[PDB]
Amino acid sequence: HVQADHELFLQAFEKPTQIYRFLRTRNLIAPIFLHRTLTYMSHRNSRTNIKRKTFKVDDMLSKVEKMKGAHLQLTFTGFFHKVTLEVLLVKVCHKKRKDVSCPIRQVPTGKKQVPLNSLAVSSNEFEPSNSHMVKSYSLLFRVTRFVAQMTVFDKNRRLQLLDGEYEVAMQEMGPTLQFTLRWRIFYQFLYNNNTRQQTEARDDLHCPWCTLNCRKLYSLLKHLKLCHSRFIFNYVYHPARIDVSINECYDGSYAGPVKRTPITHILVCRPHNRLYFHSDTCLPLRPQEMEVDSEDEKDPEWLREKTITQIEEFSDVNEGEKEVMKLWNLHVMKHGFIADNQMNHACMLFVENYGQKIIKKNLCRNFMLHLVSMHDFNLISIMSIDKAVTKLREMQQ
Amino acid sequence: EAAFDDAVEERVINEEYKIWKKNTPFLYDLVMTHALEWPSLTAQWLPDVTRPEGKDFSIHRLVLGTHTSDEQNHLVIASVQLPNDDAVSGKIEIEIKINHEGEVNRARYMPQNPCIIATKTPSSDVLVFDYTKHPSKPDPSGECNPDLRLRGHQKEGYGLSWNPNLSGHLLSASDDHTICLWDISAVPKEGKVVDAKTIFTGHTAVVEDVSWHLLHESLFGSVADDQKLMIWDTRSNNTSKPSHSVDAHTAEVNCLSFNPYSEFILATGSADKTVALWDLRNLKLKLHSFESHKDEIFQVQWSPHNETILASSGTDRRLNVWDLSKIGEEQSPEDAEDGPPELLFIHGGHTAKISDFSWNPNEPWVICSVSEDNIMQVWQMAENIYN
Amino acid sequence: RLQANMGAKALYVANFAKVQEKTQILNEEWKKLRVQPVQSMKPLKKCTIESIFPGFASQHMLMRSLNTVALVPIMYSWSPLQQNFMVEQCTPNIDGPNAKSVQREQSLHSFHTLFCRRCFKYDCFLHPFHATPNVYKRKVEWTGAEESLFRVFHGTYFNNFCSIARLLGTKTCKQVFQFAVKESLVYNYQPCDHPDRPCDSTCPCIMTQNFCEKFCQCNPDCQNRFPGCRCKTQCNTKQCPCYLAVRECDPDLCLTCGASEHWDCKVVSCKNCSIQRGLKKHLLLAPSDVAGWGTFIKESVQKNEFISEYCGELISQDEADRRGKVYDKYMSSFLFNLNNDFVVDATRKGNKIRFANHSVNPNCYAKVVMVNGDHRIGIFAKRAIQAGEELFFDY
Amino acid sequence: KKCKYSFKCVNSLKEDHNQPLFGVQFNWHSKEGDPLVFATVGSNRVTLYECHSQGEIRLLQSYVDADADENFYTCAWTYDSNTSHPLLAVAGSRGIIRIINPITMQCIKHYVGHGNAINELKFHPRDPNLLLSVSKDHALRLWNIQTDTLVAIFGGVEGHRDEVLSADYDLLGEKIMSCGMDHSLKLWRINSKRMMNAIKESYDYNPNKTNRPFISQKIHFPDFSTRDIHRNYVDCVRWLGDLILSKSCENAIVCWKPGKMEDDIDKIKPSESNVTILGRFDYSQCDIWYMRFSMDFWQKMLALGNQVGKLYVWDLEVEDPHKAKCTTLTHHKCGAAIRQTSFSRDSSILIAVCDDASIWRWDRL
Ligand SMILES: [Zn+2]
Ligand SMILES: [Zn+2]
Ligand SMILES: [Zn+2]
Ligand SMILES: [Zn+2]
Ligand SMILES: [Zn+2]
Ligand SMILES: [Zn+2]
Ligand SMILES: [Zn+2]
């Protein structure tokens, strides 16, 4: 398994699975249709229409009428100086016309011993009454053995101080204090009829990418078939086996003031394999001979005939020179050589490939001339030429 | 930046529409996806019906508006073939097409005389047609023949409502801070134009829906874009102060509807992504706020065949329908993951702004819907859902 | 002037005689055969034939269908290729009897002027002219052929008598010694000539914006020459020195990658010298489902993998312009611009990869690579591709 | 000399489709004494026809293909070696070569190897199994129908540089000429050992016995070429013994041979360039493309058409071809262009086609 089809497999299951991973969050936060209302998936629902029979819309107002019929946990902490402490709600009201000083009311909750060098609970005891009378509600912390306040309630019923631990200074008549405010299935993928990957479902029926907890296999199969339509699923009991395949016939289009022509669509009222051809002949290629006899290799005869007739067309060239020229052309075309050092072997192939031809034509002198010619270009050494001609003349004798 | 986002959103909407087209044969008893030549900002079933005893399918009728551009507007009276209890057969047929003055924003048939149909315009002059007098085809010249014109506003709007008890009493709204009320029964037949019988002006914003109370003809209700609902008594001789006025929503209110069975209870749909339930005995307390829609709601209609059912739709491209009897009920966690318990169905078969929808007064749990992208759907949910 | 009318008459009557006897023996051969006659069916469409001449009735006959067949697109003739192409004293034989004396420079004139360095052939189809003759310069009875052989042998050896005595065999060391005693008295690559001078601005290599190579006869201690890569791995990344420029690997210089190994096998480490060795994928022909013909691939290939290489006739810019103007009537423009100097025209000759088409969403791509100075094409994959899939690349 | 031919129009039929015809060929391979038969063809309508002494052209068969857009060009007749039945061979613009067995009246065989339209079909005279096919795709082909495979491709890099219009064997079946729009008259050979043992291996081919493909022996090197005999397009070429007859849009037939007058036909090299214009025949009004001439089996005469209707006839038995007595044939109804003519085995019957769906007949007297 080379990485080519592996990578294409990975991409072809990345893009639809990426689209479905997007659609997962999309239909979670913005569902398209309620899954409870499906006929093949109704176990998710956990109620019936019994209450609709005994319901009465006119009698609903009494229920909300009888419905109309924070948990401040102030925790103290050890002080930072060099005793007991008590919390109090200081309600400062609006100024009435008869009074010149503002109304002030100090409701102490209770005392508690705290170290130096408990808690108090308040279950919605603001007592503002929503009558436009509570201008501010501060939290005073009395101590002995340093007293100070802090604006808790804002003007617009906003909270000033944050939750969690905190600390605040004080002044009798550095030294401070601390407190804490608080308000088994098995997928088998198949692409070009190749078992590219084989896995096993971790969960029993939790979908792999949609992640819905369906307690039935038929509902899971119908969900995988209808939804997530880029794939095609097949099922046979053989531990469960699922056979996945890519659907290469999707309906990808737009599917949608401005004019258009009218239509009336109604759907429900009461429910490698392609042939090939040769290159030069263009005849039909049988499937039996595809890898064997690979065309476009073993370079054609018209190039050889062109190399023949081109150098034969040359005027001021002799007969044996043209003969050894076409022999060298056929040799280098039969075995391509681009490396310079490999040419030292190439001549040693020539006597081993056409030596008997040149003895039958007496072309050894022009062959040595061609050898010296290529030697002039500094392609080969001269002792290699000596070895080659000695090896040729040994077998020639 | 925005164009590519709209493009990929349209691709996702196409994928969701294909998924809906694949999944629809397990949810509905009837489906009929029809596209019109022009869009429709209004759709309403009529009470007439024909039942050939030899054939299995019944015939129903629809009133539909148009919203055109550089073309004559045709108010459509169409027909539809609904299988009753048996049987792939049934098509849409356009019966009558009447030339209309400009586009259409709202259209309502008289419950007393179904032949009389009031319609709005993009100008002040709304009008009223009677198709029995008109011919069965349109005029190619384009000069419309209005049967009963009506004036009194200074701008366009969306609100329109007939009085079910009193004949001729017709309310209409407009965004010029006025609510017109006409009574066409008093004018003779020769008089084709009628002045405003009365105009009410108490709001301080764009009024966007009005409706007569059903079992009490002496008052009506309205909601406006001042975050305000106002119940107006007709007996009072003061056209400024209403009988009740409530800040019933956090944003601009868009639609209202009264119950056919009950008389005091009503529902509203607003632009703060909510439907709300109110009562005509103590309008101070908000009874309940249904929050599943995620955009501006534009229409809500109580069901005629059921009392504890509500509907809503807007530019979210998903028509919601709710059951009031299932309110505040405990359910499974996976059942709650999809949505609240009261939410009965989410018909997300559209691909654009759901412009209008309506119920049929003589068939169970069936509705029609019209969008701006030249789509007109009709469907009835399965029996297994509601039982 | 006109002394062949009677001769033409004689030739014509002779032609009549031999064609008459040819037809006679053909008649004798045909008379042996005995074939059956045609027989029609007893008389859906119809076909009637009238007659302008009266006296003949209108002859009717029911129509008979024929078996349908699969149509294919249009293809003009061509032939395959693997290398590029280009289109724009007697000195008798040494072995023959009429050989005569001739100097070393005149004897090797045709060999040196026809021999080519960059391909090791004679009169190849891409090198029209040789660079210079200074590229090969370096620091008893006796016939004229033997004189020339002794001349070139002593020239290459500089009077090493035992070596000529070994090579010739017939001639001995003493004889050749006694004879020698009485003998004294974005542009295409182009190799330049400046051995005495260094590589400077006047050299055309720097003018072409290309680095020198081994084929140039400049100073070996130069800087403009491109040394080969030194990567032990397959060197198919951007960090390789050869991959910076458009050039490919070198057979001799790139010794670290192991390009100089035996070419008989195919499993090699260097994944860049496939153009030189020619490890191309077995493409196939088919009808494309877009426009006309197309090329399919047999084996799967990877991202930036070697699919094949384009091939065709190298021609000038104006040459390809007039060629495309001529082919505008036929509307078959398989051209592919190579560089400013030369461009490829492959309508008459080429390979299967020509048959790909244009598309907005391609999967392959092309890249120019200077293999040994030859500016060749390389068609690589811009994406993982399966077998039997379409190949597309922008021209 | 006088005309020595008493020709008179015996019949002139007109078909019911009004589409120009493109070819006509007689059943020369039939025996003696049987009822003679020939066949014409339009775009998508081939029609066989009989002939009698009194001009009673009796309709025998008429086939039509399903695809109406196809445009037929030529037809040919052949006999089978084993079954000894007749076989029509047809082709058209779809790139197809069909073989009809008119006894069974079905498409018994079909071959497809071309890219574009077929221009002309021919059959090897001695061995009746081979089948040459000329096409617009700058190349020819040679099929063998007894074994149902291809033999060779008489084209390549050295082939015609334009559309190929016609080709023809010699009478003995050892050398083929080919001509086209590229102003080239190229010779071939089917007598060397390569073509012979290639045909022999084609006869011995069987896909069921062995498992291999056929080794197609291409030919990228004709034995003679020239570009000086004509300037305009060359619509038709034929053999006469060892001499080449050819036409063109220059309104003149030319009779010539390769090389000098003394140069033999069987010893011409590929690099031969010299020619010898032995004779010419003059006529007029042949500017339109795709025009044809024809000869009999004995080749005692020659017939030709023109783009007006007034056909022409020339003799070949008499000496002095350029001083040969011509003959004209006219009528007050042939208001269309003639495309091709033909004779029977003997020189008694002559039939010609035209572009107005008209089929004219002439007979000796
Ligand atoms: Zn070369
Ligand atoms: Zn340099
Ligand atoms: Zn240099
Ligand atoms: Zn240089
Ligand atoms: Zn490298
Ligand atoms: Zn390397
Ligand atoms: Zn390397």
Cα–Cα dist B162/B214, whole Å: 10
Question: Are D98 and D89 contacting, i.e. CB atoms less than 8 angstroms apart?
Answer: yes
Helix (H, G, I), strand (E, B) or coil at A168: strand
How does DSSP classify residue C37?
A: P
Question: Are B219 and B232 contacting, i.e. CB atoms less than 8 angstroms apart?
Answer: yes
Question: Are C182 and C150 contacting, i.e. CB atoms less than 8 angstroms apart?
Answer: no
Of A60, C245, D21, A240, nearest in space to B277 by CA: A60
Question: Hey, are the CB atoms on A288 and D211 less than 8 Å from each other?
Answer: yes
Number of A to D CB contacts under 8 A, please give it: 36
Cα–Cα dist A121/A114, whole Å: 16
D214 Cα to chain C: minimum distance (Å): 17
CA A87 → CA A71, A378, C65, distances in Å?
15, 106, 108
Return the CA Rg of chain A.
Answer: 48
Angle at D136 between CA D135 and CA D139, to 5 degrees: 60
Angle at B16 between CA B12 and CA B20, to 5 degrees: 170
Cα–Cα dist A349/A327, whole Å: 12
On whether residue B44 sits in a domain, the answer given is: yes
CA C118 → CA C84, C280, C367, C372, distances in Å?
13, 22, 21, 7
Cα–Cα dist B370/B375, whole Å: 6
User: Alpha helices of chain B — where are they, by DSSP H?
Assistant: 2-23, 333-338, 383-386
Angle at C216 between CA C211 and CA C219, to 5 degrees: 90
Question: Are B204 and B177 contacting, i.e. CB atoms less than 8 angstroms apart?
Answer: yes
Length of chain D (residues) = 365
Cα–Cα dist B36/A30, whole Å: 29
CA B21 → CA A227, A260, B122, B349, C208, distances in Å?
11, 20, 36, 8, 63
Cα–Cα dist B210/D124, whole Å: 96
Kindly list the residues from chain A whose CB atom is less than 8 angstroms away from the CB atom of residue C301.
Answer: 4
Quote the tokens at residue A186.
């098995």
Q: A40 Cβ partners below 8 Å, 6+ apart? A: A218, A219, A222, B26
Strands C79-80, C349-350: parallel, antiparallel or unpaired by DSSP? parallel
Helix (H, G, I), strand (E, B) or coil at D233: coil
Burial of B48 (0-12, 13-18, 19+ CB in 10 A): exposed
Q: A228 Cβ partners below 8 Å, 6+ apart? A: A16, A20, A209, A210
B61 Cα to chain A: minimum distance (Å): 16
Quote the tokens at residue A170.
């004080």
Beta bridge partners of B96: B77
Helix axes C173-181, C144-157, angle to 10 degrees: 90
Cα–Cα dist D306/C395, whole Å: 48
Interface of A with C in 239-298 (CB under 8 A): 272-280, 282, 285, 290-291, 294-296
Cα–Cα dist C263/C83, whole Å: 18
Cα–Cα dist A78/A61, whole Å: 52
Question: Hey, are the CB atoms on B25 and A271 less than 8 Å from each other?
Answer: yes
Question: Are A290 and C298 contacting, i.e. CB atoms less than 8 angstroms apart?
Answer: yes
- As residues whose CB is below 5 A from the ion ligand 7, the structure lists C 229, 235, 249, 257, 270
Of D328, D326, D246, nearest in space to D279 by CA: D246
Cα–Cα dist D325/D3, whole Å: 7
Task: Identify which ligand lies nearest to the alpha carbon of C226.
Answer: 3
For chain B, the domain total comes to 1
How does DSSP classify residue A312?
A: H
Burial of C141 (0-12, 13-18, 19+ CB in 10 A): exposed
Q: C333 Cβ partners below 8 Å, 6+ apart? A: C324, C327, C347
Q: What is the Cβ-side half-sphere exposure of residue B76, based on CA atoms within 13 angstroms? A: 26
Number of C to D CB contacts under 8 A, please give it: 175
Question: Are A269 and B89 contacting, i.e. CB atoms less than 8 angstroms apart?
Answer: yes
Helix (H, G, I), strand (E, B) or coil at C314: strand
Q: Is C75 on the interface with A (CB under 8 A)?
A: yes
Question: Are C34 and D86 contacting, i.e. CB atoms less than 8 angstroms apart?
Answer: no
CA A110 → CA A88, A126, A138, C17, distances in Å?
8, 16, 16, 147
Cα–Cα dist B213/B105, whole Å: 22
Phi-psi region for residue B169, left (φ > 0), alpha (ψ -120 to 50) or beta? Answer: beta
3-state helix, strand, coil in chain B (%, to 5): 10, 40, 50
Question: Are A213 and A206 contacting, i.e. CB atoms less than 8 angstroms apart?
Answer: yes
Question: Hey, are the CB atoms on A264 and B13 less than 8 Å from each other?
Answer: no
| Residue-range domains of chain C with CATH | 100-181 (no CATH), 276-381 (2.170.270.10)
Angle at B246 between CA B244 and CA B248, to 5 degrees: 140
D and C interact (at least 3 Cβ pairs within 8 A): yes
Q: C195 Cβ partners below 8 Å, 6+ apart? A: C134, C217, C218, C219
Question: Are D46 and D53 contacting, i.e. CB atoms less than 8 angstroms apart?
Answer: no
Cα–Cα dist B72/B82, whole Å: 30
Tokens 């209870």 -> residue = B265
CA C1 → CA C7, C11, D91, D218, D255, distances in Å?
13, 18, 47, 43, 19
Quote the tokens at residue A319.
């007969």
Cα–Cα dist A159/A166, whole Å: 15
Interface of B with A in 177-236 (CB under 8 A): none
Helix (H, G, I), strand (E, B) or coil at A383: helix
Return the CA Rg of chain C.
Answer: 33
Quote the tokens at residue C283.
């493409």
Kindly list the residues from chain C whose CB atom is less than 8 angstroms away from the CB atom of residue A363.
Answer: 95
On whether residue B173 sits in a domain, the answer given is: yes
Of D264, D267, D260, D179, nearest in space to D223 by CA: D267
Beta bridge partners of D163: none
Return the CA Rg of chain D.
Answer: 20
| DSSP-assigned letters across all residues of B262-298 | -SSEEEEEETTTEEEEEESS--SS--EEE----S-EE
Q: Is B295 on the interface with A (CB under 8 A)?
A: no
CA D13 → CA C52, C54, D16, D39, D57, distances in Å?
6, 10, 10, 13, 9
Catalogue the long-range contacts made by B168-176 (C-beta closer than 8 Å, 24 or more residues apart): B169/B212, B169/B217, B170/B118, B170/B128, B171/B210, B171/B211, B171/B212, B171/B220, B172/B118, B172/B120, B172/B126, B172/B210, B173/B207, B173/B208, B173/B209, B173/B210, B173/B222, B174/B124, B174/B207, B175/B206, B175/B207, B175/B208
- Element housing C22 (H / E): helix C5-31
Question: Are A244 and A16 contacting, i.e. CB atoms less than 8 angstroms apart?
Answer: no
End-to-end CA distance of chain B: 48
Question: Are A113 and A57 contacting, i.e. CB atoms less than 8 angstroms apart?
Answer: no
Q: For the domain that residue D299 is a member of, what is the CATH number?
A: 2.130.10.10
Kindly list the residues from chain A whose CB atom is less than 8 angstroms away from the CB atom of residue C145.
Answer: 365
Cα–Cα dist B171/B118, whole Å: 10
Q: For the domain that residue B319 is a member of, what is the CATH number?
A: 2.130.10.10
Cα–Cα dist B205/B177, whole Å: 6
| DSSP-assigned letters across all residues of C42-98 | ----EEEE--SSTTSPPEEEE-B--------------EE-SS-EE-------SSSTT
Question: Are D276 and D257 contacting, i.e. CB atoms less than 8 angstroms apart?
Answer: yes
For chain D, the domain total comes to 1
User: Alpha helices of chain A — where are they, by DSSP H?
Assistant: 3-29, 50-53, 61-67, 217-226, 301-312, 319-334, 343-359, 364-376, 382-396
Q: What spacing in Å lies between the alpha carbon of A186 and ligand 2's midpoint?
A: 66
Chains contacting C with at least 3 CB pairs below 8 Å?
Answer: A, D
On whether residue B347 sits in a domain, the answer given is: yes
Of D331, D168, D325, D312, nearest in space to D237 by CA: D168
Q: What spacing in Å lies between the alpha carbon of A330 and ligand 6's midpoint?
A: 28
Q: Diameter of chain B by CA atoms?
A: 66
Q: Is B55 on the interface with A (CB under 8 A)?
A: no
On whether residue B1 sits in a domain, the answer given is: no
On whether residue B102 sits in a domain, the answer given is: yes
Containing structural domain, residue D44: 5-365
Cα–Cα dist A171/A272, whole Å: 90
Q: Diameter of chain A by CA atoms?
A: 146
A207 Cα to chain B: minimum distance (Å): 14
Question: Hey, are the CB atoms on A52 and B31 less than 8 Å from each other?
Answer: no
Helix axes C161-168, C144-157, angle to 10 degrees: 130
Helix axes C161-168, C173-181, angle to 10 degrees: 120
Kindly list the residues from chain D whose CB atom is less than 8 angstroms away from the CB atom of residue C61.
Answer: 59, 61-62
CA B227 → CA B220, B252, B301, C29, distances in Å?
18, 5, 20, 110
Of B57, B69, B61, nearest in space to B44 by CA: B61
| DSSP-assigned letters across all residues of C138-189 | ------HHHHHHHHHHHHHHSS-HHHHHHHHSSS-HHHHHHHHHTT------
User: Alpha helices of B332-376 — where are they, by DSSP H?
Assistant: 333-338
Burial of B246 (0-12, 13-18, 19+ CB in 10 A): middle
Length of chain C (residues) = 395
Of C61, C53, C37, C49, nearest in space to D361 by CA: C53
Question: Are B118 and B108 contacting, i.e. CB atoms less than 8 angstroms apart?
Answer: yes
How does DSSP classify residue B361?
A: T
Q: Is D95 on the interface with A (CB under 8 A)?
A: no
Strands D358-363, D8-14: parallel, antiparallel or unpaired by DSSP? antiparallel
Cα–Cα dist B130/B110, whole Å: 10
Cα–Cα dist B76/B38, whole Å: 10
Question: Are D295 and D324 contacting, i.e. CB atoms less than 8 angstroms apart?
Answer: no
Quote the tokens at residue B198.
């009365």
Angle at A4 between CA C278 and CA A187, to 5 degrees: 155
Question: Are B219 and B234 contacting, i.e. CB atoms less than 8 angstroms apart?
Answer: yes
Residue of D nearest to A310 (CA): D271
How does DSSP classify residue B307?
A: S
- As residues whose CB is below 5 A from the ion ligand 1, the structure lists C 116, 119, 124, 126-127
Q: Is A58 on the interface with C (CB under 8 A)?
A: no
How does DSSP classify residue B2?
A: H
Cα–Cα dist A396/C147, whole Å: 24
In angstroms, this model's resolution equals: 4.8
Kindly list the residues from chain D whose CB atom is less than 8 angstroms away from the CB atom of residue A293.
Answer: 212-213
Quote the tokens at residue A263.
């239509």
Q: D269 Cβ partners below 8 Å, 6+ apart? A: D223, D224
D106 Cα to chain C: minimum distance (Å): 7
Question: Hey, are the CB atoms on D105 and C349 less than 8 Å from each other?
Answer: no
- As residues whose CB is below 5 A from the ion ligand 4, the structure lists C 192, 205, 212, 216, 218
Question: Are D224 and D158 contacting, i.e. CB atoms less than 8 angstroms apart?
Answer: no
Length of chain A (residues) = 397
Question: Are B231 and B242 contacting, i.e. CB atoms less than 8 angstroms apart?
Answer: yes
Q: Is B96 on the interface with A (CB under 8 A)?
A: no
